[PDB]
Design a protein around this ligand. Structure first.
Ligand code: CDL
Ligand code: PC1
Ligand code: 3PE
Ligand code: 3PE
Ligand code: 3PE
Ligand code: 3PE
Ligand code: 3PE
Ligand code: 3PE
Ligand code: LMT
Ligand code: LMT
Ligand code: LMT
Ligand code: LMT
Ligand code: I49
Lengths: 98, 63, 459, 347, 140, 113, 97
């Protein structure tokens, strides 16, 4: 054995503070902690951040690509060209081995 | 940042990283040659300094 | 990245110079403001990544992981401040410092443009994580858990260090942009078989790979709640992020080197999902769930297709928010009954109704209910694996059946049935606990509306 | 010992080492070692007890034997070259003898048996000199003769030192023996890279000396020489437990701490020479060092061991030990990694 | 050791197996003698006879491991008709590890030795094929 | 170059490190950390106690660090100077290659199926 | 020397006795003075890596002077042949031997 403190009893925050938010023993600090979590977490990051994401300017240019593709399809069908060719690079610029 | 600034900032980054990469390869091949042949400033292990020799006439002639 | 590194550092003076009663209020408030500004990283282009300087860059892979990392620090603070209430004031400040220093290494790790800088920061996260587990864990086994965590990682990391330096000697650079243009194929040889292994084993241990996962049930269980939140949500994703980057320089050798590790994963997930059915410890059950989910990420990274990389990226983000929420849910029970045994406290939906809603929502996301991003990622990985080989649908399908069984088994056992008669200290859920739960689930469910920002570079 | 006598003897320890480092003549190198050996023995016996007598006797026998082998190598070199210049040796048998002699003086395995015993038997202050300052003279000689050193011999000594140093530390509870086996292991890294890049040998030597001095100074501050007496430190000077933790993590080579820098650079220089198997083996074997460093951190900083009632009487007095340079040393021991390119000052 | 090592690598795989077993047995016996010399010097035997008993027990054990390895790896190469395959050294390596478990009477040491002797031997053949250097010559 | 000299005279043809060098600032920060550790181990008020002592910790770290960085920069200049001079002296060992475009160079395609 | 304070300070602590061809009391020469002088001047400044091959002739002559190994090998042969011939009676030494 030895000289050791006994395990301290369990402390229920609601006995001293029935209106406890669960942050701090001090009721004034406890209210402030709840306020910053809710305002900065829900009001700022989640609400404004969601609005920011929704109005991102053409994320990864998927909207420009659709506009560009329409321009190409219109030009190619009008002039009789194929819509898409199997060759990505012009074969005149390629020198095959052998 | 507009695409042009990011695009041309990337080329500035690529140039420095490409220049450094080439120098690193050159350094490894320079080190390999200097060590094998002993003909460069690196891996220059000292030999006895010849200013230590005394060229005065000696007590006997044949030396 | 200095607009995130510097303010993250400034959290340390803020915590140390705060009034003794405001350390949690101040750090939580300001880590949320940092979390807000991280959304500026979503200035992503279709062709070019966002390259800030010679040191740091951001792309659609690192950006969501960075946003998850900076969001988790506020949540780890709220989760911790209850069980550290009796702690000495200076030791409380040190605990917060470890979390801040962990965030600093993480945000630099995910954005380092040079692989050796990534390696040093990848390794630097061990120190704060090890200190958090061993200093502030509750049980005797936390000391052994730290040793397993440390040496499982290092046993794989040290070969990686040699491999990276060898790659720099022969290629002349480890900058990731350079590696995209100077990459050469890897031709078969016993020398290259071991270069491949040294490049992949460090990341597999972190995932973890089935077979090399034993450190995780120990570490994820012995850690304090904040330690478990970061271990599951982010640190496991260093393995996935590392693999996603280094596999660029391993082709075409990945064609046949992936086979032993795809087999370990495909069979591993069924083995680790089945384990969860007979787990007696709630935290241990959640930990083994992470192994099952990260097995899909390993397979998706190895088969190396556009759909599997999108699915892997979605899974890593979705798992981070879900697994973190589940640990927090189980912690709230533990802070009431001081035991991790799952069968100890039952019928809790009768005593804690709202908190039973969080349990349900967390469970549904875990079993990948559509259209959650958990399902989006898990479905994209299954689509690409079917093409890789049609028979994999059998193993993916079975895992989806088993995953639902243990996800709802945990929900049923703890929340439904009859309450345990002799447990009479189930106090009503605190505001802190309810808010902590909703800060996981709400962002997770919102991302369903705009999933393209968590699908990675191949979107 | 009279304070003036102690200072004069310490200056003779340094003068002997400095003679070795400025000498262009093998005879003066041998004189420097002899002068150094002469002045350190009274420092080992300074406490006059049977264990210090045994420690000094074992040290004298080992060092005096090595000096004979060193002088034999010099005389063979004289016969086959007719000169005394300190540089590469001109006879392979002279190179073997000089290399074995310097390994003996360094306490490298398998010539290592004296290091754990001698360090344990002398005070902490004397052990600090033995494991730091005394490495300078043999290392400075190796730095100059390495072109003629047999590659298989020096790498065999380095590998055995890393293994035996790592394994030997696992079974120790005495702090001085833990530092001794740590020193044996670290010597292996120093001489493993010597044939490839001697500059990296000096960086490893300098960083090792800083970290070793930091640990010995912290042990001296609390007058702790066992694992258990060091486990009371949390209940006296909490700050010291944190400094010990940081240094021990650093000595284990963990990023982002300074002690990772030498291992990092040594692996780089070895891989540049297509040495892959050896650096991988060395790094994995060094995990044994980290293991028994971690045990110390567990019993010192990361847990709170039982204390005694009489310890309360210590709370009422401040640390009175000099702890010279300790604030600087601990910072350098832990926070140098961002300045790694500074190693070019050693070229 | 340099000469006894060259002999082994200078006689092709599967050709002159008996000669191969001579070289590997010679290596194993030398290793056992070195172990005996250090053991006898650092843990003095109770009597001269007991020192001889310990030496002959280590030297035979070490020679048996060398004999079974050099034979089995040569037989595998001959039978399989694949002289360049590391797998032969794995089979030879594991067999040596098994013999070590036999001479020690301990299935656990037999199992662990088979795995690490087998893998180590396989790594040796790969390094020979690919030119891996253990004590690499300084070049840069 | 010069024997047992910290800063050979040829080093003065190089620009000195700026006093706002980021590495010098880090070194100064280390001096500050040393000052705080000095207060902590002696149980003095860490931030406030002995500001003169803390000042000397910062100043002495910066003072030594400035000369180390000056020598560090010099030694890397010497490395570059040696390497390029050697390349000039042995052109045949460092030939300038003929560069081919990807349209001409054959690279094998490995499908990911 | 590891630290060349001798060169910087311009003080000769021990390099006066490093070589046998340095200045001696009363100009007494060593037996191999010329050979050492020739090897030292050949290798001066070019470094050991080059000197080990480009001054091999000089070093071999210097080594032969120092240890005379080849000279005794030659005298051994002549002395062995003579003792063989004498006993066989084939050879008679001249009167002055
Ligand atoms: C050039 C040529 C080389 C130049 C040298 C030429 C020779 C000139 C002499 C040189 C000086 C010799 C000094 C001998 C000495 O002082 O040792 C005394 C040493 C201790 O003296 P002691 O206190 O009287 O103990 C007596 C009994 O040995 C006490 O026995 P015990 O009570 O301890 O009973 C157990 C005993 C049992 O002994 C054994 O186990 C023997 C096992 C051998 C395996 C077969 O334990 C041992 O003896 C272990 C040590 C055996 C020697 C190490 C062999 C490994 O006793 C001996 O070892 C006897 C050796 C005498 C012959 C020396 C031969 C020299 C050759 C060396 C190798 C040449 C390399 C070139
Ligand atoms: C009613 C029928 C029942 C349907 C169920 C109700 C749901 C629909 C109601 C909403 C309808 C409005 C709508 O969808 O538009 C939204 C739109 C989606 O539709 P949209 O793409 O067409 O956008 C509309 C605006 N324009 C037209 C300009 C494009 O935007 C969003 O979805 C917002 C995305 C929110 C995600 C951001 C999460 C916050 C991030 C905080 C950081 C920390 C989190 C953790 C980090 C994790 C890693 C990233
Ligand atoms: C900069 C770039 C380079 C990057 C490398 C890493 C940089 C950091 C290097 C660290 C070097 C060591 C300096 C660390 C300073 C530690 C400060 C500290 O410990 O706080 C002081 C306090 C002492 O307590 P006390 O004096 O009694 O005051 C009353 C409170 N009890 O201490 C205590 O009371 C603690 C007592 C309980 C023990 C808790 C132990 C767990 C916390 C350890 C945190 C520090 C870990 C540092 C290791 C590196 C981290 C990455
Ligand atoms: C066990 C630890 C103790 C024993 C030490 C381990 C060493 C034995 C492992 C052998 C690994 C294979 C190997 O060493 O490859 C050497 C090879 C040399 O080839 P090189 O000459 O440099 O390049 C030109 C090729 N003609 O190297 C190369 O070509 C480059 C290869 C990149 C570097 C690879 C580093 C070695 C990786 C081995 C471990 C990998 C498995 C990791 C296991 C993790 C466990 C959790
Ligand atoms: C760069 C590294 C610098 C290392 C600085 C070392 C500082 C050590 C100071 C420790 C605390 C003060 C102290 O007292 O040291 C012990 C020793 C004096 O002995 P002590 O027991 O205190 O009392 C003697 C009375 N008989 O003090 C001594 O005698 C000094 C022994 C250490 C000398 C070697 C230090 C390492 C090598 C320095 C060169 C750097 C390369
Ligand atoms: C330079 C070239 C040197 C190459 C060989 C170096 C080996 C030197 C080893 C000396 C330090 C290690 C000493 C040691 O390991 O302990 C002595 C050991 C005793 O072990 P033993 O009695 O045989 O096992 C009893 C089982 N009941 O005795 C031994 O058996 C160790 C044998 C190691 C041989 C290698
Ligand atoms: C802009 C600056 C950003 C900060 C960068 C930090 C980088 C790591 C620097 C390590 C050196 C830390 C300073 C040495 C420790 C001194 C502080 C201490 O020991 O105790 C805390 C002390 C307050 O306690 P007290 O002793 O009572 O003094 C009262 C003074 N008001 O003193 C105090 O009041 C607060 C002093 C600061 C507390 C430091 C806590 C140690 C942190 C170690 C964690 C590792 C660092 C993070 C890793 C990433 C590195 C960038
Ligand atoms: C590699 C990149 C990084 C660069 C690393 C550079 C490392 C080397 C740089 C030097 C590091 C040591 C700096 C020490 C600063 C603290 C000195 C101090 O504050 O002393 C205060 C006082 C004594 O001051 P005093 O000696 O009287 O000043 C007049 C000098 N003629 O008395 C005191 O109370 C001080 C007690 C604390 C001192 C600890 C014990 C050491 C004793 C130091 C004596 C004075 C040092 C003067 C430093 C000048 C160096 C230029
Ligand atoms: C979890 C662990 C996973 C382990 C995975 C194991 C993967 C095994 C890959 C084996 C293929 C290695 O790659 C193979 O190496 C040998 C090197 O000897 C090369 O072949 C080379 O050596 C062999 C000798 O054996 C000769 O037959 C051949 O003429 C020569 O070119 C082959 O051209 C190459 O196909
Ligand atoms: C831990 C679970 C263990 C489960 C067991 C897993 C066994 C895994 C064995 C690893 C793969 C070994 O088999 C591997 O097959 C691929 C082909 O697909 C070969 O790949 C190579 O050979 C093929 C033809 O054979 C060529 O097109 C080409 O040279 C190359 O692709 C490898 O040379 C071979 O090493
Ligand atoms: C290509 C060549 C391959 C060469 C292979 C070389 C293999 C290495 C052999 C090293 C020498 C043998 O090593 C030694 O074996 C004996 C087995 O009798 C062990 O000895 C132990 O096992 C048995 C019974 O328990 C007894 O010998 C002894 O009682 C006990 O100490 C030693 O613990 C071990 O140190
Ligand atoms: C517990 C694990 C401990 C660490 C294990 C480390 C494994 C290291 C494997 C050995 C490395 C390679 O080992 C060595 O390679 C070289 C080639 O470079 C071979 O060298 C050989 O090549 C030629 C032909 O190839 C031979 O005629 C010659 O005898 C020899 O020079 C050696 O025969 C081999 O022994
Ligand atoms: N590898 C060796 N043994 N020698 C060596 N350092 N070679 C590299 C050459 C070098 C490196 C840095 C600098 I600064 C300078 Cl001036 C020269």
């Amino acid at each position: 054995r030895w000289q050791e403190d006994p395990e301290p009893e369990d402390e229920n925050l609601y006995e001293k503070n029935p209106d406890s938010h669960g942050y701090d023993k001090d009721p004034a600090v406890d209210i402030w902690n709840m306020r910053v979590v809710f305002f900065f977490g829900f009001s700022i990051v989640l609400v404004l951040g969601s609005t920011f994401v929704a109005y991102l300017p053409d994320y990864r240019m998927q909207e420009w690509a659709r506009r560009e593709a329409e321009r190409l399809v219109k030009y190619r069908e009008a002039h009789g060209l194929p819509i898409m060719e199997s060759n990505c690079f012009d074969p005149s610029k390629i020198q095959l081995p052998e | 940042d507009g695409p042009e600034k990011n695009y041309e900032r990337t080329m500035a980054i690529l140039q420095i990283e490409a220049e450094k990469a080439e120098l690193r390869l050159k350094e490894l091949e320079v080190r390999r040659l200097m060590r094998a042949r002993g003909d460069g400033p690196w891996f220059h292990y000292p030999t006895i300094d010849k200013e230590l020799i005394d060229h005065s006439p000696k007590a006997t002639p044949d030396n | 990245m200095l607009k995130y590194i510097i303010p993250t550092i400034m959290l340390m003076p803020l915590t140390w110079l705060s009034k003794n009663n405001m350390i949690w209020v101040n750090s939580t408030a300001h880590s949320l403001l940092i979390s807000f500004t991280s959304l500026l990283l979503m200035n992503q282009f279709g062709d070019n990544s966002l390259n800030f300087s010679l040191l740091f860059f951001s792309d659609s892979l690192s950006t969501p992981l960075l946003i998850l990392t900076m969001w988790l620090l506020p949540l780890m603070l709220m989760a911790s401040q209850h069980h550290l209430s009796k702690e000495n004031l200076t030791r409380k400040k040190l605990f917060i410092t470890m979390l801040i220093s962990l965030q600093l290494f993480l945000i630099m790790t995910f954005t380092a443009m040079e692989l050796i800088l990534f390696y040093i920061l990848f390794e630097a996260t061990l120190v704060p994580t090890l200190i958090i587990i061993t200093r502030w864990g509750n049980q005797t086994e936390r000391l052994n858990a730290g040793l397993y965590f440390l040496f499982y990682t290092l046993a794989g990391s040290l070969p990686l260090l040699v491999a990276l330096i060898y790659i720099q000697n022969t290629v002349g650079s480890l900058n990731f942009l350079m590696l995209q243009y100077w990459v050469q194929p890897v031709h078969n040889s016993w020398s290259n078989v071991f270069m491949w292994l040294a490049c992949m084993m460090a990341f597999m241990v972190k995932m973890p790979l089935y077979g090399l996962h034993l450190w995780l049930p120990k570490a994820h269980v012995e850690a304090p709640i904040a330690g478990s939140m970061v271990l599951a949500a982010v640190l496991l994703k260093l393995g996935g992020y590392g693999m996603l980057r280094i596999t660029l320089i391993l082709n075409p050798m990945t064609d046949f080197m992936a086979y032993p590790f795809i087999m370990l994963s495909l069979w591993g997930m069924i083995m680790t999902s089945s384990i969860c059915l007979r787990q007696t410890d709630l935290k241990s059950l959640i930990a083994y769930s992470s192994v099952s989910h990260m097995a899909l990420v390993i397979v998706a990274i190895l088969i190396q297709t556009p759909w599997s990389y999108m699915g892997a990226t979605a899974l890593m983000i979705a798992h981070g928010l879900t697994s973190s929420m589940l640990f927090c849910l189980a912690n709230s029970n533990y802070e009431r009954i001081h035991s991790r045994t799952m069968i100890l406290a039952r019928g809790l939906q009768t005593l804690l109704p709202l908190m039973a809603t969080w349990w349900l929502l967390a469970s549904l996301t875990n079993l990948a209910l559509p259209p959650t991003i958990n399902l989006i990622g898990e479905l994209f990985v299954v689509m690409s694996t079917f093409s890789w080989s049609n028979i994999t649908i059998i193993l993916m399908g079975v895992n989806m059946v088993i995953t639902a069984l243990y996800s709802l088994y945990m929900l049923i056992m703890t929340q439904r049935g009859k309450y345990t008669y002799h447990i009479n200290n189930i106090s009503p859920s605190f505001t802190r606990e309810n808010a902590l739960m909703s800060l996981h689930i709400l962002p997770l469910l919102l991302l369903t509306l705009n999933p393209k920002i968590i699908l990675g570079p191949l979107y | 010992m009279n304070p003036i006598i102690f200072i004069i003897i310490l200056l003779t320890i340094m003068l002997g080492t400095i003679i070795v480092m400025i000498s262009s003549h093998w005879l003066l190198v041998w004189i420097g070692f002899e002068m150094n050996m002469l002045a350190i023995i009274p420092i080992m016996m300074k406490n006059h007890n049977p264990r210090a007598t045994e420690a000094s006797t074992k040290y004298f026998l080992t060092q005096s034997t090595a000096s004979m082998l060193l002088m034999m190598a010099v005389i063979i070199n004289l016969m086959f070259s007719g000169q005394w210049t300190v540089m590469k040796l001109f006879n392979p048998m002279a190179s073997m003898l000089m290399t074995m002699a310097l390994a003996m003086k360094l306490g490298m395995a398998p010539f290592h048996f004296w290091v754990p015993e001698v360090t344990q038997g002398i005070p902490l202050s004397s052990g600090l000199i033995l494991l730091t300052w005394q490495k300078l003279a043999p290392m400075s000689v190796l730095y100059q003769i390495f072109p003629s050193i047999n590659l298989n011999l020096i790498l065999t000594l380095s590998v055995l030192s890393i293994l035996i140093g790592g394994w030997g530390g696992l079974n120790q509870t005495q702090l001085r023996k833990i530092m001794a086996y740590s020193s044996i292991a670290h010597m292996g890294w120093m001489t493993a890279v010597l044939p490839y890049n001697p500059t990296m040998t000096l960086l490893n030597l300098i960083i090792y000396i800083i970290m070793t001095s930091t640990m010995f100074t912290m042990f001296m501050a609390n007058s702790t020489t066992t694992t258990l007496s060091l486990s009371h430190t949390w209940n006296k000077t909490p700050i010291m437990t944190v400094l010990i933790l940081a240094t021990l993590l650093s000595m284990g080579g963990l990023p982002p701490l300074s002690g990772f820098m030498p291992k990092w650079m040594i692996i780089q220089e070895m891989t540049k020479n297509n040495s892959i198997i050896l650096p991988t083996f060395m790094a994995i074997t060094a995990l044994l060092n980290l293991y028994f460093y971690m045990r110390l951190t567990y019993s010192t900083t990361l847990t709170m061991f039982p204390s005694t009632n009489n310890m309360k009487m210590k709370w009422q007095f401040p640390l009175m030990k000099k702890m010279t340079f300790l604030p600087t040393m601990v910072v350098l021991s832990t926070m140098m990694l961002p300045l790694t390119p500074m190693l070019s000052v050693l070229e | 050791a340099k000469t006894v090592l060259r002999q082994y690598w200078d006689i092709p795989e599967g050709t002159e197996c008996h000669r191969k077993t001579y070289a590997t047995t010679s290596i194993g016996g030398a290793a056992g003698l070195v172990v005996s010399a250090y053991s006898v010097a650092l843990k003095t035997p109770t009597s001269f006879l007991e020192g001889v008993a310990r030496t002959g027990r280590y030297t035979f054990t070490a020679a048996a491991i060398g004999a079974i390895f050099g034979l089995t790896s040569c037989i595998s190469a001959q039978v399989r008709e694949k002289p360049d395959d590391p797998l032969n050294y794995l089979i030879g390596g594991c067999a040596g590890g098994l013999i070590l478990g036999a001479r020690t009477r301990s299935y656990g040491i037999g199992a662990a030795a088979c795995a690490y002797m087998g893998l180590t031997a396989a790594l040796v053949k790969m390094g020979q094929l690919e030119g891996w250097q253990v004590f690499a010559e300084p070049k840069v | 170059r010069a024997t047992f000299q910290f800063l050979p005279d040829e080093a003065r043809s190089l620009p000195p490190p700026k006093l706002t060098d980021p590495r010098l600032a880090f070194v100064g920060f280390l001096g500050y950390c040393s000052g705080l550790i000095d207060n902590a181990i002696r149980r003095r008020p860490v931030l406030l106690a002995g500001l003169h002592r803390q000042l000397l910790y910062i100043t002495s770290f910066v003072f030594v660090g400035y000369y180390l960085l000056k020598r560090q920069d010099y030694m890397y200049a010497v490395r570059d100077h040696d390497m390029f001079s050697y390349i000039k002296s042995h052109p045949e060992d460092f030939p300038e290659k003929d560069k081919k475009t990807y349209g001409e160079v054959f690279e094998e395609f490995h499908p990911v199926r | 020397p590891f630290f060349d304070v001798q060169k910087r300070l311009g003080v000769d602590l021990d390099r006066w006795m490093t070589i046998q061809s340095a200045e001696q009391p009363h100009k007494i020469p060593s037996r191999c003075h010329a050979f050492e002088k020739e090897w030292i001047e050949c290798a001066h400044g070019i470094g050991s890596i080059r000197a080990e091959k480009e001054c091999k002739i000089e070093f071999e002559d210097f080594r032969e002077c120092l240890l005379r190994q080849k000279t005794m090998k030659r005298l051994h042969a002549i002395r062995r042949q003579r003792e063989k011939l004498i006993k066989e009676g084939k050879y008679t030494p001249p009167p002055h031997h």
